[PDB]
Amino acid sequence: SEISEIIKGRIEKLDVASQARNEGTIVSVSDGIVRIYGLADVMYGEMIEFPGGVYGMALNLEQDSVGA
Amino acid sequence: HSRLLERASRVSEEYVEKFTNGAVTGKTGSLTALPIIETQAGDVSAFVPTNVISITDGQIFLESAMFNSGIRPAVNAGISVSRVGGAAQTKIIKKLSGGIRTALAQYRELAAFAQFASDLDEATRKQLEHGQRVTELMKQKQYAPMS
Amino acid sequence: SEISEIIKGRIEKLDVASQARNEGTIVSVSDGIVRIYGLADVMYGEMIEFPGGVYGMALNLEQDSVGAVVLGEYQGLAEGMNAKCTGRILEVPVGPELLGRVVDALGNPIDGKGPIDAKATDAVEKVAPGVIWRKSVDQPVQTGYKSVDAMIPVGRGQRELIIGDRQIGKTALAVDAIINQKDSGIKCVYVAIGQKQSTIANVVRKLEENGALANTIVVAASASESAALQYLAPYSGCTMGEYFRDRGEDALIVYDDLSKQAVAYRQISLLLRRPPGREAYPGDVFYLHSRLLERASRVSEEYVEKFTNGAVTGKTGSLTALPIIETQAGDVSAFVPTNVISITDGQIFLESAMFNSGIRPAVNAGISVSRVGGAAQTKIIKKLSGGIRTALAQYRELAAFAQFASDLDEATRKQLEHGQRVTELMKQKQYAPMSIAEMSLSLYAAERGFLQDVEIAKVGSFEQALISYFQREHAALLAKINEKGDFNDEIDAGIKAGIEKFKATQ
Amino acid sequence: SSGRIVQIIGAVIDVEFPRDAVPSIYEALKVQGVETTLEVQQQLGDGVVRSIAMGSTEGLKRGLNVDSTGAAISVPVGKATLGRIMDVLGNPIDEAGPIGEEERWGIHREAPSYADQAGGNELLETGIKVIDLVCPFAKGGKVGLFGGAGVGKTVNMMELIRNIAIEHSGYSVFAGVGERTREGNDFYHEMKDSNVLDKVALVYGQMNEPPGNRLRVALTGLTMAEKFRDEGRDVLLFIDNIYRYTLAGTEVSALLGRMPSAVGYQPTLAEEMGVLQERITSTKKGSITSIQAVYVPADDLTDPSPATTFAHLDATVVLSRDIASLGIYPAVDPLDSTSRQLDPLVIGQDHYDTARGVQYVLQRYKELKDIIAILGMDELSEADKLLVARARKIQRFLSQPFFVAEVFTGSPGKYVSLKDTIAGFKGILNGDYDHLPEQAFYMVGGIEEAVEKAKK
Amino acid sequence: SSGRIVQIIGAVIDVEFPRDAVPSIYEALKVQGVETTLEVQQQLGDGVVRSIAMGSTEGLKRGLNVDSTGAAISVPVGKATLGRIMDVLGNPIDEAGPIGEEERWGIHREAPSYADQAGGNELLETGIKVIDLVCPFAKGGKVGLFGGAGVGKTVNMMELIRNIAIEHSGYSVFAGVGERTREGNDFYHEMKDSNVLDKVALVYGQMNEPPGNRLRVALTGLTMAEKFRDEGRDVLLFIDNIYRYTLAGTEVSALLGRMPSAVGYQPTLAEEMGVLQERITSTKKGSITSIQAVYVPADDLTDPSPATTFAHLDATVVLSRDIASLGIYPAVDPLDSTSRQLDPLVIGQDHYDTARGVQYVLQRYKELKDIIAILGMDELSEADKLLVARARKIQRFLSQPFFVAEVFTGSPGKYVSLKDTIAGFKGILNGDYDHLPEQAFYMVGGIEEAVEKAKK
Amino acid sequence: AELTTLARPYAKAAFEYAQAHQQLADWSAALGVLAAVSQDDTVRQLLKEPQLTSSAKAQSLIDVCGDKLNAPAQNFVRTVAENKRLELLPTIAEMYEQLKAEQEKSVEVEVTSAFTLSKEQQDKLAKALSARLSREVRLHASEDASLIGGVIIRAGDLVIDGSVRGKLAKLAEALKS
Amino acid sequence: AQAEIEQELNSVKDALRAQVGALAVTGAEKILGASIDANAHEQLVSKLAAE
Amino acid sequence: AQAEIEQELNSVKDALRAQVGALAVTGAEKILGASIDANAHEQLVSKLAAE
Numbered sequence A: 001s002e003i004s005e006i007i008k009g010r011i012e013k014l015d016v017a018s019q020a021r022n023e024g025t026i027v028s029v030s031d032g033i034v035r036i037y038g039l040a041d042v043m044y045g046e047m048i049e050f051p052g053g054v055y056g057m058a059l060n061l062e063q064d065s066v067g068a
Numbered sequence B: 001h002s003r004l005l006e007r008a009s010r011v012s013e014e015y016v017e018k019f020t021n022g023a024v025t026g027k028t029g030s031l032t033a034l035p036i037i038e039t040q041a042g043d044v045s046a047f048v049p050t051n052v053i054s055i056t057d058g059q060i061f062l063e064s065a066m067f068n069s070g071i072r073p074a075v076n077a078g079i080s081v082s083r084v085g086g087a088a089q090t091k092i093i094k095k096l097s098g099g100i101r102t103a104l105a106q107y108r109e110l111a112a113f114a115q116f117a118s119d120l121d122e123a124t125r126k127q128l129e130h131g132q133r134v135t136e137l138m139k140q141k142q143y144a145p146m147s
Numbered sequence C: 001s002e003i004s005e006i007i008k009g010r011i012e013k014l015d016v017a018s019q020a021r022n023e024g025t026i027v028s029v030s031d032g033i034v035r036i037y038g039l040a041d042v043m044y045g046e047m048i049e050f051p052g053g054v055y056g057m058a059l060n061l062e063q064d065s066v067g068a069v070v071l072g073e074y075q076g077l078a079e080g081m082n083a084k085c086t087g088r089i090l091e092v093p094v095g096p097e098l099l100g101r102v103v104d105a106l107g108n109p110i111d112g113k114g115p116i117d118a119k120a121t122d123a124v125e126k127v128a129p130g131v132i133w134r135k136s137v138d139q140p141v142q143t144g145y146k147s148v149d150a151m152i153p154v155g156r157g158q159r160e161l162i163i164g165d166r167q168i169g170k171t172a173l174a175v176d177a178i179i180n181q182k183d184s185g186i187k188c189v190y191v192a193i194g195q196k197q198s199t200i201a202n203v204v205r206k207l208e209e210n211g212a213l214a215n216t217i218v219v220a221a222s223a224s225e226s227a228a229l230q231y232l233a234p235y236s237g238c239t240m241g242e243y244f245r246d247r248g249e250d251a252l253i254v255y256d257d258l259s260k261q262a263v264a265y266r267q268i269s270l271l272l273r274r275p276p277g278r279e280a281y282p283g284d285v286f287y288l289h290s291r292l293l294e295r296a297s298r299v300s301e302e303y304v305e306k307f308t309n310g311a312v313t314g315k316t317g318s319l320t321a322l323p324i325i326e327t328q329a330g331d332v333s334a335f336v337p338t339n340v341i342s343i344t345d346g347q348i349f350l351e352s353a354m355f356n357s358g359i360r361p362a363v364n365a366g367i368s369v370s371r372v373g374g375a376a377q378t379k380i381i382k383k384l385s386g387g388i389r390t391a392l393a394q395y396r397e398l399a400a401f402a403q404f405a406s407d408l409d410e411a412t413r414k415q416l417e418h419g420q421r422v423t424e425l426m427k428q429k430q431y432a433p434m435s436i437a438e439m440s441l442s443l444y445a446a447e448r449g450f451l452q453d454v455e456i457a458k459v460g461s462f463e464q465a466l467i468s469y470f471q472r473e474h475a476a477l478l479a480k481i482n483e484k485g486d487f488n489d490e491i492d493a494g495i496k497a498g499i500e501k502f503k504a505t506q
Numbered sequence D, E: 001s002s003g004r005i006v007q008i009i010g011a012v013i014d015v016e017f018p019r020d021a022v023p024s025i026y027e028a029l030k031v032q033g034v035e036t037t038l039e040v041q042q043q044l045g046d047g048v049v050r051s052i053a054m055g056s057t058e059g060l061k062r063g064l065n066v067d068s069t070g071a072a073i074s075v076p077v078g079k080a081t082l083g084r085i086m087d088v089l090g091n092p093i094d095e096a097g098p099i100g101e102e103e104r105w106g107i108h109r110e111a112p113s114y115a116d117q118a119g120g121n122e123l124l125e126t127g128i129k130v131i132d133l134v135c136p137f138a139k140g141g142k143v144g145l146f147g148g149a150g151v152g153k154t155v156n157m158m159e160l161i162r163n164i165a166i167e168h169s170g171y172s173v174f175a176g177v178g179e180r181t182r183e184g185n186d187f188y189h190e191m192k193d194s195n196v197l198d199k200v201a202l203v204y205g206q207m208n209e210p211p212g213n214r215l216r217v218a219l220t221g222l223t224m225a226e227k228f229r230d231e232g233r234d235v236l237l238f239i240d241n242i243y244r245y246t247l248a249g250t251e252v253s254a255l256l257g258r259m260p261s262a263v264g265y266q267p268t269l270a271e272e273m274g275v276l277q278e279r280i281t282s283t284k285k286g287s288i289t290s291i292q293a294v295y296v297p298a299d300d301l302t303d304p305s306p307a308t309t310f311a312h313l314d315a316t317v318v319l320s321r322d323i324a325s326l327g328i329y330p331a332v333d334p335l336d337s338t339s340r341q342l343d344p345l346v347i348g349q350d351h352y353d354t355a356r357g358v359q360y361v362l363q364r365y366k367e368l369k370d371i372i373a374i375l376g377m378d379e380l381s382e383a384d385k386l387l388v389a390r391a392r393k394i395q396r397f398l399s400q401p402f403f404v405a406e407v408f409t410g411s412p413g414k415y416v417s418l419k420d421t422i423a424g425f426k427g428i429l430n431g432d433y434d435h436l437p438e439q440a441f442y443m444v445g446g447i448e449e450a451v452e453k454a455k456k
Numbered sequence F: 001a002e003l004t005t006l007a008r009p010y011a012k013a014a015f016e017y018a019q020a021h022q023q024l025a026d027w028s029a030a031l032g033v034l035a036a037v038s039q040d041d042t043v044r045q046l047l048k049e050p051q052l053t054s055s056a057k058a059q060s061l062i063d064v065c066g067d068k069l070n071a072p073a074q075n076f077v078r079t080v081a082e083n084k085r086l087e088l089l090p091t092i093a094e095m096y097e098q099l100k101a102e103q104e105k106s107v108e109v110e111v112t113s114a115f116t117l118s119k120e121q122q123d124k125l126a127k128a129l130s131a132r133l134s135r136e137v138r139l140h141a142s143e144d145a146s147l148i149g150g151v152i153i154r155a156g157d158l159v160i161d162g163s164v165r166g167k168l169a170k171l172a173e174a175l176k177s
Numbered sequence G, H: 001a002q003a004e005i006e007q008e009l010n011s012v013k014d015a016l017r018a019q020v021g022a023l024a025v026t027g028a029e030k031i032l033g034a035s036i037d038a039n040a041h042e043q044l045v046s047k048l049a050a051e
């Protein structure tokens, strides 16, 4: 098959667990679409807040990542 | 379609006798096929119509303009053709229908050319008159076959 | 008598020491693409060496494997075979030793006449001379055709496209343009891409029968050869043509099918899995032809003195290109034709309707154009081509009235027959190139009205007889015009007196 | 060593071998138990090869052992192949038992080198007016019969075979590629009943056979012709449809992991065609004269397959659906058909002027046709009225009844010598037969007959 | 910090950086030991960035070190760029040494905000009569230039370059998007000979450069123009061909693997055009006005490229081959050329009525000329023959001697004002000059010069 | 994609962790054991069933290895199983050593001599090879009777050949060209 | 026709020169295959150690 | 010429066999970088049985 967004060298699950459901980390950026890892409680169509006053909209809620 | 349509065939006496283990001898066997294909607004360039026209032993093209013009059988004699020809006809019909399709194909062309021309020779007027009669004869009603 | 005893000694003057070699192993082989595992130091464009004297070029340097294309036959290569870096980019032999020889896309001789003695090699992929090192195009390149040399002139360092459908004279026009250079001073290069081997041999047999082969380099990459060789052949031929330009001389190059080079580059790209665009071509198909065609140029005296390091001085070198492209049913809006029409300095359009109407050269002069124009013409042809343009333009406007010419007004009826006589003058035969003096007689005779009493059906025999008359009784005047194509009141009066005398006795 | 089937998808099969025993590209493999042959097309990696079945896969299973043969498909060649019907693998497909071969060649081979090509212009007479006039064939030359569906490719080829192969003193190879099984039976009984089967080798791969069979049948027939050429003989090679070779590659290309190109064709269309076409040639040892029928998808001559084929041929004969739709046969298009032998330095000025004369008259009439439809005939000038008559007659005089078409035409077949072909058209262009009605030139062989038909 | 090249596929290069040092989108990167610049297009994630080489990739290998610069491609700006030829990166392609720059600006920025827009429509007085009357340009506007070669395109650009600098204290910038190297050398010498070279900055992206260079050259030239606008000037930005800017975007989009849109264009077609065109406007400090040559694919005005470009054009200037033959060198077609500023609510009732009066008279004359040709000059009424006389006088008064054309015209150049232009045409329409010969109204400048050329 | 491409994230994760916690030798043994267990025909068959959940497959593998996996290794195994990558364990085990070797400044060379073997010979070249490579060299000598006389030294993508077969190859292409 | 005679002669003699080389390679191989000993193998290994 | 070439060809055909042994010992000597004569004797007199 093919490598997915969660499959990164820094996603070290040393402590297998889940914490921080209202915050995430940007995985990649391309032509106005961002992949975010960790936003566990984000709703479909919710406003996402990024640094420097920029906002995103949640469109793809997948097992491993959020597309905005 | 080629794997389906190549089964429709005529088999020799030797083929039937072997399969029937000698039970049937002196008899040839056959399967004749009449596949149907639908086109969109007369477009034959589509992938499926292109494939099937290239597999069969002939085709019968039905035209919508002819169907609306009163020729209900609607067989376009210029585009339709049989790759068996006269071998598929009885002696009487084979002799009487000699070059009628190619003569109808030429009459359809002569009519369009002479639409706005001045009086032509006897040969032309005679051919134009003979053509309008076989065209009216080829018309037939549904459920009314002829021996 | 024998030779073998004096050659073995040289082989005993070759190194046997160990050399560090960066190496990989073949992992997969398919459709002419060998994927190798290893080769961490191979460069984009470097040539790889496989077992058996087979060579490749690295084109996909991905993170985990190398995608390489075979410059030969790949059906003998296999998984587990060893692959070695060579440390070299692709280079071809260059120099005068290539003239009169037939070679493959790598410079190997295929004619069977023996080994080439080239004293230097050069890179197939190179950058074109920059803006500031060029000189404006103002020297002519005669093709020997009255329709092309009078209305669509080609200059030294220009790029003129030959465009049109299949089987209408595209190859004939370019081969005749090469034949006409045998006495000019311009060296010629013909590149055959994706042609069948027997067709290339009929052109060489025709170059040899007309005495043009000794002035021509023939580069071949036939239809059964690897797509990599067909993709590289135009660059190899260009590199052989650039030798003469960079050293102060002039050359002419013909690319017989740039559309077949584009098709070969598309095959390699889709097999490397590069993202596709319009008509399935890769995103850099414009850059493919543009990188090739911008090398055809005219360079200044300062570039030639810099390159030659002072050896050659006062001379400007050039490379003129005649790329050929085939259109499908007259569709010039296709992707590859659109790209090349925008890259070139002008276009010669050949038409199937004109070719079937007996107009053998088939040049549609109404849409064909040369952006260099009159700067690429000698003084005599520049003066006599102006009226030829007006007469053909008038004929294109008033050609339906031909069947109602009686009812036409006299002025218009006068213009109509002039247009029909100038149109019949443009018809010419294959392998019959005309010189500046011989073209001038025909153009002068029509432009000064000497055909008004000649039946449109006898214009050709009139032309052929007129040239034969001047070749015998006016040999000194033809020799004078052929020096530089100069014009003055004495030449004008001299030609007039000869045509008047011709009508009075022949 | 031995391999196991790991993946079957349609006609494509993957076989995994020890990483030290991976079979070569184009190598033939045999399945254990099942009677099936697989040719390696690609080495995916890790001891696995991708192959295409030369038979059906309905009986194949995952894990079946496959054997490496160490070579490509080897077919029988030489004198033993004459008067026999064979499949792609060279097996006999006639009930006459085994073939006494004394040698087997591999179907894959290099094309003759640039130094081995040979040039010749010996004119070959066909007996057809349109061809003998605008498409003069040459001995050792390559001919192509381009056309759509139902316009005459098979019929015309059969007439040529009859007017050339029967008289030809040398041998002949007939390859039926993606052909109707009924045409193959009619031709076999025809060669057998005509006593000419003794000098003709027959290879058949019809439409009912798997893609791999239709993809290599052309290489089998060509391998037999190459053995005869290399013996110093003069050979005739007839291919029923070379398009089926390209199509079999399109049908299998996507399953082989190749991205599609324009008009959904394999990205290797021009190379796969060049690799076959460069072997069908006349070298310095012997001469192969070849006639290929070329199918044109949807009658569009700009389709990538027909468009890539023109450059490989010496003589290009074009059949038109618009001419066939008017009851005119052979339906050759004189303004689209071409030949390299059409050159005054190869034939003569009289022939060339007659051909260009016919073309000029037909090209001008193609524009007056629409003018006559709108308005009327009366509005034309006298020269145009006079030209329209000769054009309509020349179009009809190009029609010739053929012996192979008697079943369809109903009339007897006719053979016209090039002399009569030139004489008649020259006279019509001169206007000598302007006294004859238009209907007199339809299917009348020589011009003389036309003069007689006008009286009936 | 520094990263390493991980993958090379044509002009597309992937580079891997430390997790704390990943470069930003559009950031410029430098390869160590080679003169190659990479512009970052996308952040793939896991430390890796996708960039497009701004040069050739031949000879590069995996593992080479790459250095981040901290900002986008930064080019020299200001007075030092005048009379110089530069590449996409701002390097001096002419052999004239380094540019005497005092400042450098990045090529990527947002368009001026809603609050930065000027308070109305102000005409740009070009000093050319036919343009200032029939094709009025607005300051900060975009003008589409249509026509073939050899019709005066280059001379018209040089005259505009001279007039903005000498009569308005402005400057010019020329962006050679996909420039032909031969034409780029010829244009540089023509401007030096015409003494206009010190009034313009030349930025060239030649056809043989990779797609990324041809796409960014328009932003490099626009960045130099933005600097002069901030100085307090009105500037001219010439774009050699706007279709080649669209095509370079299509090529880059295909290389990056994006899914293509309608007719095969990039999905970002309207956004890429908007990002370039929205910077060209009239601000509260200065105004960049642009003249852009437009190419129409397959002569189709509905094709996505023409369609998108026309949405940002304020005027259309058409150059005519026919008009040139007449002898009017400006060669602008008064009937086909148009402007959105030709509205009485913008230019006032007087300018509008004068321009529409000239167009009305010129239209009637074109209809009457077909009558004179088919039926003869006597068939016309007295009013129609009087109109023909005014139309011919109007047609010749649309001509003008330019300061850069003195070599061709053999007469000194003229700069006519908008006031003099309106007054001159208003009189000829009313008949105040009906006694003068039409030739007196040829190549004169203002209307008083026609009256004086007449006395003689 | 290449198993190496799919194993690169997992391997770099194992290495950055082993290095920051001084466990570069413990993980080598754990990954070698995990790779080993997964290849067995019984375990291979078990891992390919649709009945088991990702956690059940992960657990079964930690139980067979047991002490061989430290708390962190067992969690890494749970990450690999959750993502459905248990077929890449041999590849993941291999790439870990490569990152480690570049860290330790060492190379595993693979020398192949024709007919002679001596303790003096191995070191004689390990000095030059070390000097050239700027790394410690763990030679792995072996026998290649195919060679007429000489040795073939392989290290990374570098292949220093001094075998007479290599001189034969050179002499042969030279003589036939 | 005049040039074709010389190229034929030099082509055939060259084809022979390559065959002679292939026999010489085999000879050298058979000779070395019966001449390498420990005193020579050490010289080969120690010589390589300096390269 | 094709008939003439065959007359000279049959002379070189056997003349080459008289010197292939020298090419083999010099080749072996250059490959080894030392004297080979001590092991050339039995090879030089026997290899000619397949040339």
Ligand SMILES: Nc1ncnc2c1ncn2[C@@H]1O[C@H](COP(=O)(O)OP(=O)(O)OP(=O)(O)O)[C@@H](O)[C@H]1O
Pocket: C165, C166, C167, C168, C169, C170, C171, C172, C173, C326, C360, C361, C428, C429, C430, D311, D339, D340, D342, D343
């Ligand atoms: N004066 C002429 N100029 C050009 N072609 C001519 C002329 N007179 C006759 N012909 C014939 O026209 C044909 C042109 O063939 P040519 O190969 O040049 O066409 P082409 O367009 O290049 O064909 P292709 O596309 O297959 O390469 C030849 O048969 C040639 O002999």
Ligand SMILES: Nc1ncnc2c1ncn2[C@@H]1O[C@H](COP(=O)(O)OP(=O)(O)O)[C@@H](O)[C@H]1O
Pocket: B058, B081, B082, B083, B084, B085, D147, D148, D149, D150, D151, D152, D153, D154, D155, D156, D329, D330, D402, D405, D408, D409
């Ligand atoms: N010369 C001809 N005379 C009569 N019928 C013909 C002729 N050529 C083709 N046909 C008709 O077309 C068919 C045979 O043509 P064929 O060779 O099969 O065409 P294609 O191969 O182009 O599909 C038959 O149905 C026959 O009636």
Ligand SMILES: Nc1ncnc2c1ncn2[C@@H]1O[C@H](COP(=O)(O)OP(=O)(O)O)[C@@H](O)[C@H]1O
Pocket: E148, E149, E150, E151, E152, E153, E154, E155, E156, E329, E330, E402, E405, E408, E409
């Ligand atoms: N304003 C003008 N006055 C006089 N001659 C002109 C003028 N504009 C164009 N020409 C003539 O037309 C030619 C072509 O004009 P140019 O601007 O170079 O068009 P293009 O760049 O397309 O070639 C010039 O060389 C000159 O001969």
Ligand SMILES: [Mg+2]
Pocket: C170, C171, C256
């Ligand atoms: Mg050609």
Ligand SMILES: [Mg+2]
Pocket: D153, D154, D155
């Ligand atoms: Mg058929």
